[PDB]
Design a protein around this nucleic acid. Sequence first.
RNA 1: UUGAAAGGGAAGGGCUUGAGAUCAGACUUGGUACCGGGCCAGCAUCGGUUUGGAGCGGCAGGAUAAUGGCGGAGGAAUGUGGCACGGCUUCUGCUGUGUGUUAUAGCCUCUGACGAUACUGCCAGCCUAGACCGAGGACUGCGGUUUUUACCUAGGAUGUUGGCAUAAUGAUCUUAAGUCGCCCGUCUUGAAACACGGACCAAGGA
RNA 2: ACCGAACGUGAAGUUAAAGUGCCGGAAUGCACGCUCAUCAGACACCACAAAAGGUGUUAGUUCAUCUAAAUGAACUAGCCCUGAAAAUGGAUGGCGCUCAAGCGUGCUACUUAUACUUCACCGUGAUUGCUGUUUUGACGCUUUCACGAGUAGGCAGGCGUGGAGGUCAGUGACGAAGCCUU
Lengths: 98, 199, 51, 192, 106, 61, 171
Amino acid sequence: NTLLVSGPFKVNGVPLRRVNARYVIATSTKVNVSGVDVSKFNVEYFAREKEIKAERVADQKSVDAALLSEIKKTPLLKQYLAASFSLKNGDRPHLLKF
Amino acid sequence: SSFEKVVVIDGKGHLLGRLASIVSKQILNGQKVVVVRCEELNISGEFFRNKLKYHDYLRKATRYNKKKGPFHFRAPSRILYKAIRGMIPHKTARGKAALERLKVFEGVPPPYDKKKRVVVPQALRVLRLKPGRKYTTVGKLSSAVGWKYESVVEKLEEKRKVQSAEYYAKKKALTKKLNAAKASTAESEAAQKLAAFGY
Amino acid sequence: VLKKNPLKNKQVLLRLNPYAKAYAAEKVGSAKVEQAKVKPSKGQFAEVLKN
Amino acid sequence: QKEYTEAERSVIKAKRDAKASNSYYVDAQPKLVFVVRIKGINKIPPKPRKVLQLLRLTQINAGVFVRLTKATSELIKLAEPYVAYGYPSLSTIRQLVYKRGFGKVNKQRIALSDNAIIEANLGKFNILSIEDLIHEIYTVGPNFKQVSNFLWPFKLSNPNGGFRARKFQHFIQGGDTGNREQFINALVKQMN
Amino acid sequence: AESHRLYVKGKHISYQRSKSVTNPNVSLIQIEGVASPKDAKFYLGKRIAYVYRAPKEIRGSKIRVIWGKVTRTHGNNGLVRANFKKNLPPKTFGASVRIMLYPSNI
Amino acid sequence: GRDHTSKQHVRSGHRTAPKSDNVYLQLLVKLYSFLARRTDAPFNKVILKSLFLSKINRPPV
Amino acid sequence: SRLNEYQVIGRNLPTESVPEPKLFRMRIFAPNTVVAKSRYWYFLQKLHKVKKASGEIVSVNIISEAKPTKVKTFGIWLRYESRSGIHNMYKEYRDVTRVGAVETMYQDLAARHRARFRSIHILKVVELEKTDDVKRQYVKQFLTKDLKFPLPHRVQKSKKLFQATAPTTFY
RNA sequence: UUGAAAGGGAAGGGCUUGAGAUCAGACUUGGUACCGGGCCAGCAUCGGUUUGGAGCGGCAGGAUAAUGGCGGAGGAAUGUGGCACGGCUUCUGCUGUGUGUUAUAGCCUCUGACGAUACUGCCAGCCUAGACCGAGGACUGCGGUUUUUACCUAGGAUGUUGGCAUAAUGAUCUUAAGUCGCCCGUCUUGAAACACGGACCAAGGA
RNA sequence: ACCGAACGUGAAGUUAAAGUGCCGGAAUGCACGCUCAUCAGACACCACAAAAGGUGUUAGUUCAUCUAAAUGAACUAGCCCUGAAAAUGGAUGGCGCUCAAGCGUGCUACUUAUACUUCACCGUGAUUGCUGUUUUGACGCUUUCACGAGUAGGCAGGCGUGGAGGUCAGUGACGAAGCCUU
Ligand SMILES: CN[C@@H]1[C@@H](O)[C@@H](O[C@@H]2[C@@H](O)[C@H](O[C@H]3O[C@H]([C@@H](C)O)[C@@H](O)[C@H](O)[C@H]3N)[C@@H](N)C[C@H]2N)OC[C@]1(C)O
């Protein structure tokens, strides 16, 4: 039931990991990931067994490659992904479009 | 309707009871309120009638010892305070805490002279009363029942208004300069892109 | 051990009323009615307007 | 289902034919009412109290089906300032029976959750299913007495949305009691 | 940046009550910027944290939390009813609470 | 609230067991309770209720 | 939205002596049909010596406005009961429907004469076709040439408790 | 006496939670590094109850809505253009009064064929947002899908994941806050009574 | 003692009467008017007011004089004013409120009782079944439904005390009984 996300790690510092759909805000911005190879990412990939296994680093590089390929097609999208989100004074989440 | 650190209200032209109920509910919910220019508050009805009402208030006093009786405060801010306290459960600890969130003043003393003052439309006299009705200014009523500092407040208010007009002239000059600067950098690429976004 | 509302539970509805399947499949709730366009009030009945 | 639709279309046709032939079609008077007690149990005079007991209306928001004749009309006349009643539609009867329908089996309130329960207690009167029971109520049939007495008094909730500002005066004067004649269905939708 | 907030500001207004009897199990919460029942329904089911400081450290921290959730709207002015694991103590009438953006349905 | 049509929580007013503490009378009651429960012969139910009766309700024959 | 206009038609129950009783119509301003038939029987019992038990309602029908978007002036004739007697009176109203003018009349007699709904009989509601049929000046002043007037002292209704700008009433 | 705590014209009490103190428990009488379990929680789906949405769609009725729009006939004035007379206009909404009937604006009444909308009701139509609850404990019943003595949402909650077990979790004591709470017993129609007995405690006491 | 509603111990929902400017949960909500009082008024029982006056204002009835530009007379009843004087200082509950937060009327939403609806648990009364499996509990076990206010009073089931018959081959100087104790 979880969601597979990536920063990309080179952009944000957040890697391939699972998140729960109830703890996420889905925006309007869309990136074409139709050419990203995410076939082999399953539950057992994030199975529990600090240092990161070399395979995980390699897959992070592999996915981030195509990700960064598509991201630069959208102007300012990369810098948008690099910046954190927060609620400013007067921001009403019930009135806001994401 | 945002939660503010302090809300500073210009009391000029507000009706006593309506402002009192709004401020009572504000302080009871944890909002700090300052009301300035209480001498400029309004009460509906002609001056003579409200003077009669205050004299009816004055008549009430503990018979066996006048020093225990109700204490009749004459200053305009204390008239507003009496109105507000009657709308608070002031004999509870929560009510005392709520009343500790309120400050009322004659005139506009520092540091509130250089802070933003707001109005309360639901309590404003010019918006609430029918145009032909008569009303009382609380400063005039206070003087008629024993408040001693009307002329002092008037003089200090004149001085403050001179200083504030000087402040505003400087602010207006800078604003005009900045507006000219913004208009000069118009028809720019960033400006056009912003205009496409509504800004 | 537990009463289940037939108006909410479809299985209980079909357990109590088998015809509910025919009613749904035949769209009885939104069935069209064939008839002709007529105005039978255009004569005397128009005394609804004034007497 | 066929005879309900045929009855509806024929009444529509007879009204439309009366307009053409310079006549007036008067609907058949209602044969059925649904009676809801909307008054509590305190301070009731003896005669309406007995009448309410005889209608099996012994709690607030209890509802029963009554076949209309002169005898029952005078009965309901006595209890008028303590009840709200009107003429139930087919869908109202179906919703009441489906959601809050209970049967009196050996002096016990039993949920009408299976057609076997209905058939073991009313089968001798040719009532074999919940739709037979609803039909027998709606079209006031030969065995209305047994079917309606087998039904436990319906135990409704208070209306979602409340009553009018004051209940205990007639519906005509802006209250909630007496005959409201098609608006009993809106009240039951609120309370069922 | 200068701001890091991911919650909506709120206040603990009152308990559910009649004129003379209060019900501590239900708290009435004022959500900042919410002024109608239409806008308040966005926050129904969202989690609420009351965060406070206590004299004695637990796991090295003096910060303690009482968790709740929004259950339904209250009235016509955008207040909501909330249900906390432990009833909010009445001294917090007027104190700030945190309305989370999750469980999210955006 | 309820507008009660009858008195609430009324015991039946019929004796459901012998007041006697005699063990052999209770053995007989056990036998005829089985018999009345498993046979639908009216005689056994009559005999069951009779075993419960007090002394003045069983005059000598 | 408070009221509708109905026609209610009724008669006596047919008997051997009178097999074809006369049909009587009334125009009733009521919230619903239950009240409409109740008013019909109330008036028939006051005028003729007929009770509800020996009669029957023949027809109940909505009478809709012919021109719901045409501005009209109505004359209304009334019988009402004060605290001290019974009086007749005639008033005038401007509206786009008969029901609107009747609702205004009910509000108006509530306001000026403390006359509740139960204390008023609507004798007649008439659309005044000519400017000479309009008698009262409080409606006649809205029928003059090139009528125009400002709306001074506009009070704007705010969505916030505190305003950061001075109040204004221009318009 | 010592220690802890509280305190603006009484104190005490109930309910609730916070804080401080105390007590308690499953890593079990755990099984052979793994298996498996206890507690608190997140999410998912189901069942029961229930509150919502600017909800979406189908159908029926009525004056087979009334209107409006279009076509046609008739009329009038708070009379448009035109024309005739004027006070202020180099007619620069200037302007008022007349006459009369669409003209360089329009309006009203009746009506002919279509087409909608409101209002009321039905749908065993669809989509969608929250809350509370999970009683029972092999099977047995009624139904459903039929692909089949199989499976199901159909005689009451399960799946999965994280954390913790030196702990969150619960209970009691003290205290603060919010809210409510007059002194018992008795005689009495009626007691908190400005009606009577009662300063306190032990033992005896019908 | 009135209105609502009658009460086992709880959860969720909805209400009754009464309310929604603040004290106080719920609208300074939508709407047509009336009223300005130098003792306004503000909600049943209920915490009073009369006869009688007003050219204050509002709406109505019936007559009359009018171009041979409107006006005059009598009258009806709404709110307001006068009639309306008591002793400690003080009560629309208080604050306070004037296109109201007053009076008459219509509407939309909303607030909350030990009441109503569904569910859990306790008790009472009834009710289903239970012997070749009844088997060492049949005064038991088990299925289902309804109900629960109470002085005087009746009855039932239990708790505690001194002493007596029987039993536990019961506890105890390695500490009985008593007493003190978050
Ligand atoms: C419509 N009926 C009215 C009834 O409402 C009431 O009227 C009072 C009137 O008496 C009051 O007036 C009276 O009473 C007040 C005071 C005692 O309140 C006195 O100051 C005043 O002098 C006196 N005339 C007036 N101020 C308000 C009306 N509604 O008194 C009876 C009545 C006159 O019949």
